[PDB]
């Protein structure tokens, strides 16, 4: 069993045009609100595999939504912010990831898709008045399709992380490579987005987005704790510089704790 779409890479279709950003199926499985900004396609699900999956697919060029020339295509759920910054603070996110098609360009720093998201604003400045802290972008890797076509294969996950807050661009962030995935495998993912004791200091507090995919961990303290106010995550489908992206998520759970 299928859920993959094979046809043509197409800005828009008639299906995917929704008229509005919140625009959702009826009890959908998938936890969070829909930011739908993209008119390839809207949120709907399939059965299969023996699940019940979300389904997220952007292509290059169909947002419809923010104005032109700014934002990349995106289909997202939000889950309501971590607002504290007391030890004992966190978002954490569960579910289960399918990859089934990332954007790709043919160079590293504008390939690639995301299929979730740590973010939280911060005192002092600095970058867009709702900033990223890191990203998690899959990559494309290419092989024989038993035809003699290369095609996606495998993902390369990464993290795009600041260097400081609101950090972007070449200077801002860093890319750091976490594993392969197969295309189609089934991977469990966490990520837990928080604030807790610093061991290394006394009083003082460590910011973090800890992942772990399909078993391995992959923990990371956000730059400059003291500034930050609050721990979000966001989960779908976002950026599709050339081609098309498709994430498939099962089983998705989400819990917060505000400790002051
Ligand atoms: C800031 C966004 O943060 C998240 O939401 C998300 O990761 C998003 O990624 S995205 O979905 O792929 O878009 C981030 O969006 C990128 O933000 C960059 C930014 O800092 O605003 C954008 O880069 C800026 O604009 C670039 C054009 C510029 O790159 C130089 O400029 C030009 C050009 O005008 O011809 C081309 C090349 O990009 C490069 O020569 C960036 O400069 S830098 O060299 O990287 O430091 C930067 O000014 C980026 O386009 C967004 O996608
Ligand atoms: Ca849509």
Same mark, same amino acid.
């Given at each position: ?63 419809? /939504? ?49 299929? /979730?998201?740590? /973010? ?88 973090? =987005?800890? =992942? ?49």
């Amino acid at each position: 069993q299928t859920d993959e779409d094979t046809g043509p890479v197409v800005d828009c279709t008639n299906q995917g045009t929704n008229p509005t950003r919140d625009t959702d199926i009826p009890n959908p499985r998938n936890i969070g609100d829909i930011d739908d900004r993209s008119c390839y396609a809207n949120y709907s699900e399939s059965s299969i595999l023996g699940k019940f999956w979300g389904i997220y697919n952007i292509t290059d060029g169909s947002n419809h /939504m923010d104005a032109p020339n700014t934002l990349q295509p995106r289909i997202e759920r939000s889950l309501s912010r971590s607002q504290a910054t007391g030890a004992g603070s966190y978002a954490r996110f569960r579910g289960v990831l399918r990859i089934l098609e990332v954007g790709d360009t043919g160079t590293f720093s504008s390939s690639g898709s995301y299929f /979730m998201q740590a /973010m939280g604003k911060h005192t002092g400045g600095g970058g867009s008045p709702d900033p990223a802290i890191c990203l998690y972008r899959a990559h494309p890797v290419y092989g024989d399709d038993g035809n003699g076509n290369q095609v996606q294969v495998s993902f390369d996950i990464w993290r795009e992380q600041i260097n400081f807050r609101g950090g972007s661009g070449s200077a801002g962030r860093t890319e750091v490579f976490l594993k392969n995935v197969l295309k189609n495998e089934q991977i469990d993912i966490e990520l837990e987005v928080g604030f807790r004791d610093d061991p290394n200091n006394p009083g003082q507090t460590l910011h973090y =987005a800890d =992942a772990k995919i399909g078993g391995e961990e992959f923990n990371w303290n956000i730059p400059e704790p003291e500034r930050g106010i609050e721990s979000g995550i966001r989960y779908g489908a976002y950026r599709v510089k050339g081609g098309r992206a498709q994430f498939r998520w099962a089983n998705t759970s989400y819990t917060k704790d505000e400790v002051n």
